[PDB]
Design a protein around this ligand. Structure first.
Ligand code: LDA
Ligand code: LDA
Length: 392
């Protein structure tokens, strides 16, 4: 009757919801070619779909943690899942690529609920031991989605309409809702205390005064930008630009995200014998080399996408190795409340992702693949520059 055993339905449905929102990005990108063809809109709106999605995900970030603390985790979390379901369904009525993009933004708001409320309840619900396993599963979900999403999405548009994908996301989120409704406990400490936006603002201005934290948080954004820009732009780079098929598009995803996974796997084996600082340095080598290779190759020949793919694969391996550690060090760089620290670094990342994808898009539209990879290289260099400051 659920006390001990079915308690695990709560983290399981949170994980399911997380997955739904992630493929809500990752399946959609390859489907954006069908979408933009349906609306008769330019291919410049393809990466923008992801920009809007991620922009929405920085929207309520700062708010939801302290808000749910006051009015409770259950009603806020469940409202987020419902909002995801409703906005997933509403996009079928879009009628315009501008209105489509607006709904991508509104959909992305659902992202904020995962970390700021759902995971806050996890940390408040479970022992440090079990909590570790849960974050591990959430981390693995974040690994699987970008691998499976583009493959499933590319296959999907040869069979079913793009609208069906949003019906899928909504269905999966519906399952999480009913699971969370009957499982998730109320962990909120600060009911019914008042919330000061004035003092909340003061907290964020305080975390932003810490220079090491800001360096680490910005670096996490810059270093992952090439990966996310590839996710955003790969449908137009491959299919539109190189005139390859959907099958090849799918194939190129395998070494890149397989390498990401390989890097995390090597991380799990090294972590007991290696400090996070040295794993950052260890990952730094394939990160810089991979980005250098993709840039140099496509400046020599704009059309070599296999060298670009290899370079991104080597880079993604380094990311897999270096990233989890930088997240930890960045978290611990500030002594403030972890909810405030987490939301701050999530917002700084999203800021770099959204703006960076847009810059990336105009880079490729004007300069082709060479410029795509050159902009990715400067982002690597920005991460590197921040690391020599960050440590020590
Ligand atoms: C490993 C890169 C870390 C980037 C963190 C992005 C937050 C996830 C928001 C949904 C986006 C899904 N995506 C494209 C990252 O796979
Ligand atoms: C020994 C410390 C206890 C005295 C502080 C009174 C509690 C007020 C809490 C205000 C919240 C501040 N903050 C940083 C969380 O925004």
């Amino acid at each position: 009757a659920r006390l001990g055993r079915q308690a695990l339905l709560f983290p399981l449905c949170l994980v399911l919801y997380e997955f739904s929102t992630y493929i809500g990005n990752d399946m959609i990108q390859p489907g954006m070619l069908a979408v933009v063809e349906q609306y008769q809109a330019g291919i410049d709106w393809v990466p923008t779909s992801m920009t809007a999605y991620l922009a929405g995900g920085m929207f309520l970030q700062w708010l939801l943690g302290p808000l749910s603390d006051r009015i409770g985790r259950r009603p806020v979390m469940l409202a987020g899942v419902v909002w995801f379901i409703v906005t997933c369904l509403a996009i079928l009525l879009a009628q315009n690529i501008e209105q489509f993009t607006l709904l991508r933004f509104l959909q992305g708001i659902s992202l904020c609920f995962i970390g700021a409320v759902g995971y806050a309840a996890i940390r408040e619900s479970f022992e440090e031991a079990v909590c570790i396993k849960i974050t591990a599963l959430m981390a693995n979900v974040a690994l699987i989605a970008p691998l499976l999403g583009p493959l499933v999405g590319a296959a999907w548009i040869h069979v079913l309409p793009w609208e069906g994908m949003f019906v899928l996301f909504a269905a999966l989120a519906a399952i999480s809702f009913f699971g969370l409704q009957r499982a998730m406990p109320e962990t909120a400490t600060r009911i019914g205390e008042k919330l000061s936006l004035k003092e909340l603002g003061r907290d964020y201005k305080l975390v932003l005064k810490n220079g090491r934290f800001v360096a680490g948080a910005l670096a996490l954004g810059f270093v992952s930008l090439p990966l996310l820009a590839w996710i955003a732009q790969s449908p137009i780079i491959i299919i539109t630009g190189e005139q390859l098929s959907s099958y090849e598009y799918g194939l190129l995803q395998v070494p890149i995200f397989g390498a990401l996974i390989a890097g995390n796997l090597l991380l799990a084996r090294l972590t007991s014998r290696r400090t996070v600082r040295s794993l950052i340095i260890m990952g730094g080598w394939p990160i810089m080399i991979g980005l250098l290779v993709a840039a140099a190759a496509t400046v020599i020949s704009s059309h070599a996408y296999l060298w670009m793919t290899a370079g991104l694969s080597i880079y993604a391996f380094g990311i897999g190795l270096a990233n989890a550690g930088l997240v930890r060090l960045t978290l611990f760089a500030s002594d403030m409340s972890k909810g405030t620290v987490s939301a701050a670094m999530g917002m700084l990342q999203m800021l770099i992702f959204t703006v960076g994808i847009e810059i990336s898009k105009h880079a490729w539209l004007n300069g082709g693949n060479g410029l795509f990879n050159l902009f990715n290289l400067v982002n690597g260099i920005l991460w590197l520059s921040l690391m020599v400051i960050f440590l020590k």
